Amino acid sequence: MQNGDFQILDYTGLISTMPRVDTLLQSMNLFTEHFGRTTVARIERLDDGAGDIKAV
Amino acid sequence: RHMARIRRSHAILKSKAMYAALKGTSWSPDDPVSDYNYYDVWGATQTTADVDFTK
């Protein structure tokens, strides 16, 4: 390096820093990925149960 | 599907009937003919050990 025009310097390298990023959820494998073909998805649901039986 | 529904409905009734016995009464929801009250039938009474948690 050169300080001004007639003087020299000592160069000590560079310092770098990056921000944090969290990855807790990705480590839990909690989601399942599907690859479709269009921008519409359909889901179907079914319910069932039981009932009473009165005396006869 | 219908067969499974029928099985589950009978199973539920059995549990309800078993539970109704502890309170001292027979289980016959829709029939007065067999609606027995065991404390009355055998001539006994119910004792209550009431507990107070507020003190």
Q: How far apart are CA B52 and CA B55, in angstroms?
A: 7
Q: Nominal resolution in Å?
A: 12.7
Burial classification of residue B20, based on how many CB atoms lie within 10 Å of its CB (0-12 exposed, 13-18 middle, 19 or more buried): middle
Rounded Cα distance, B20 and B34, in Å: 13
Cβ A55–B5 below 8 Å, yes or no? no
Map chain A to HEC letters: CEECCCEECCCCCCCCCCCCCCCCHHHHCCCCCCCCCCCCCCCCCCCCCCCCCCCC
CB B54 within 8 A of CB B42: no
Question: Hey, is B35 helix, strand or coil?
Answer: coil
Taking CA–CA distances from A53, the nearest residue in chain B reads B13
Q: How far apart are CA B42 and CA B52, in angstroms?
A: 31
- What experimental approach yielded this model? cryo-EM
Rounded Cα distance between B12 and A53, Å, is: 9
Q: Compute the 3-state secondary structure of chain B and give helix, strand, coil in percent, each to the nearest 5.
A: 45, 5, 50
Contact A52 B28 (CB under 8 A): no
- Chain A residues at the B interface, defined by Cβ less than 8 Å, are 48-56
For residue A6, how many other CB atoms are within 10 A of its CB? 6
Q: Which of residues 6-35 of B touch A (CB under 8 A)?
A: 8-13, 28-31, 34
